[PDB]
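Journal club prep, notes for RB
We'll compare a predicted complex against what the paper describes. Inputs for the 2-acetamido-2-deoxy-beta-D-glucopyranose case:
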Amino acid sequence: GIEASLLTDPKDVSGRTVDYIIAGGGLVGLTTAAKLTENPNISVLVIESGSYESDRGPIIEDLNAYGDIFGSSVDHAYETVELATNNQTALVRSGNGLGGSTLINGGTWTRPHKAQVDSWETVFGNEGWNWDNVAAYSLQAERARAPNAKQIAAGHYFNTSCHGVNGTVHAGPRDTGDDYSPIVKALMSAVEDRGVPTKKDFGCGDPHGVSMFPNTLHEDQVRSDAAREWLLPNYQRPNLQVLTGQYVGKVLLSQNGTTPRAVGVEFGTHKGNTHNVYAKHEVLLAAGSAVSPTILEYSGIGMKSILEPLGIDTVVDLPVGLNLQDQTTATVRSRITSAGAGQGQAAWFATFNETFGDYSEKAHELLNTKLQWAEEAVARGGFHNTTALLIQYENYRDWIVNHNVAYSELFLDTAGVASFDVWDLLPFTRGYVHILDKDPYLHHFAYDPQYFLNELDLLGQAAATQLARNISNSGAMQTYFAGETIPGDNLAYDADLSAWTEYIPYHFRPNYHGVGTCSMMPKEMGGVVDNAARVYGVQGLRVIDGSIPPTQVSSHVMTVFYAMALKISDAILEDYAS
Ligand SMILES: Cc1cc2nc3c(=O)[nH]c(=O)nc-3n(C[C@H](O)[C@H](O)[C@H](O)COP(=O)(O)OP(=O)(O)OC[C@H]3O[C@@H](n4cnc5c(N)ncnc54)[C@H](O)[C@@H]3O)c2cc1C
Ligand SMILES: *[C@@H]1O[C@H](CO)[C@@H](O[C@@H]2O[C@H](CO)[C@@H](O[C@@H]3O[C@H](CO)[C@@H](O)[C@H](O)[C@@H]3O)[C@H](O)[C@H]2NC(C)=O)[C@H](O)[C@H]1NC(C)=O
Ligand SMILES: *[C@@H]1O[C@H](CO)[C@@H](O)[C@H](O)[C@H]1NC(C)=O
Ligand SMILES: *[C@@H]1O[C@H](CO)[C@@H](O)[C@H](O)[C@H]1NC(C)=O
Ligand SMILES: *[C@@H]1O[C@H](CO)[C@@H](O)[C@H](O)[C@H]1NC(C)=O
Ligand SMILES: *[C@@H]1O[C@H](CO)[C@@H](O)[C@H](O)[C@H]1NC(C)=O
Ligand SMILES: *[C@H]1O[C@H](CO)[C@@H](O)[C@H](O)[C@H]1NC(C)=O
């Protein structure tokens, strides 16, 4: 089986040459490996810190076991710095194994708002990265299944024109075999009373209102992790090699006259037991948004003011690790009556005005006058160029005011409770990730999302979370509401927005959607990679993973990342062919 084909001994690759080295066997990494090795003459080696996990059992394969794997060997559990919002560290869950985070994520399959992806081209000047182009790759990746009658009756709606049916990633309705809970339709009824839409297909380009959605699972409910979808079918390809249990530490650079060229990588598990492997064409970094930037820095690609004091020679000076954008999540949970019994998930993609309610006008005044916020974020080291950050913020203001994009997500789980996980989708805060040591294998790094260090992010989160409590005992939801359990006794039930702002910093987690740490945007705008994911000033080196999106999106990110891996893989093959 696949297990027998996987490499584990570094001596099997040490000193060898392949066409492409892919650092990180995760979502983008394995999608890209699969596409590249469709040409039998192209050799690819994937190097993954973890191993194969796709047949472990329910802890991986059943989406309804979500969270059980946290804290195990399959979770990197990256620790943040001591956060300034609450003086505590946080854990950033991240998958460790073939498939990366797809091994451990919630399986939620949705797309952004059209205007968001269009702005990657029209504001961030990435030629060809508009909604229609990226969406065509997204459709190609997708192998969706329409809902059956019982799934529709629960609240599903599937637009056949918005889903590929002949692709690679199996997606369709989560269906545990229970009857579906009426709470999903009650939430829809409760928001309909407020004028909010329901059942819009979150894959069509306007994610707003309360809808169900597809999940990344096979018809038999087995998790569609990236290794099961893109590696397991293809691992017999002799030109596709996978080494497990080793970390990529740094990219090996040589001089090609005036410009450094990536010629390979060093890998290993501790200082003093490292090895080299070489790439004839390119090194492609796909270790995740917390890690790919650090790999550049360890290699001498990063900010001279960060690298020089650590004792690293800055070969290429770029703002690597800046522009980190993760969301904050909080919970509101209630007990339900026995008539609320059954399975189902749904989500409210809530607009700015839906989020703030009566605070909308004041929130808009801040949005109109404070974009000061850019100066503050820069001063905190989340970004280097105040003008370019302001442009990002004007872009979010355009999204909110001229496109009415969703600004928060209130994610409903049922299956015996009514529980919301709630996050502000569009944080203005900008954080960073930087190495704190020269030795890659020590994994000593500062990951600072700067949660709640922008006032609008704290107000918006507070307002969204308060809204979750509000809707839980509104309209049709009153049918099933059997008293709040979280915050419950920890926060008075009539708490106002001010009280919620005081509560939230002590009751949130990372959302685990960190993007931006090797931003795909022009160099003068603060970018690290061009519109073909190439690191500025280096030949044969790309960063291709969730490091690269320059903005957040009103979406779950898998649909975007599979699409982007396909789009970049074609760019790479175009270059190989020429
Ligand atoms: C808890 C959680 C829940 C989520 N829920 C959802 C959801 O419901 N819907 C959705 O669309 N998305 C969701 N996501 C997001 C999605 O899973 C990630 O954004 C996506 O997998 C990132 O893809 P990537 O290729 O950038 O990185 P990853 O998939 O994280 O892959 C990176 C790979 O690199 C490996 N690695 C790390 N360091 C090294 C090294 N130095 N050298 C070699 N290999 C290395 C890792 O072990 C990993 O396999 C969730 C993520 C998490 C953590
Ligand atoms: C996280 O911990 C730090 C301490 O490491 C807290 O910062 C400190 O907060 C206190 C207030 O609780 C500040 O004290 C104040 O000093 C000013 C003078 O600058 C004085 O005018 C006040 O009357 C008061 O004594 C202190 O300066 C500040 N910084 C440090 C280095 O101690 C921080 O507030 C904690 N954060 C959270 C979210 O709890
Ligand atoms: C279905 O998708 C098509 C093509 O995207 C879209 O134009 C039409 O509005 C959609 N209809 C609904 C009800 O989502
Ligand atoms: C949102 O709220 C403001 C009032 O604060 C109003 O000016 C505006 O038109 C509303 N926007 C939308 C899209 O309804
Ligand atoms: C929800 O919000 C409205 C404001 O229109 C308020 O009147 C109502 O009591 C709130 N309900 C709950 C359960 O908090
Ligand atoms: C800062 O950002 C602006 C806006 O993108 C850009 O015009 C300018 O060149 C940038 N400054 C630097 C030093 O690159
Ligand atoms: C330098 O050498 C590379 C070898 O990787 C060659 O293909 C390329 O044309 C050269 N170009 C520059 C700009 O240095």
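Talking point for the session: DSSP finds 17 helices and 21 strands in the chain.
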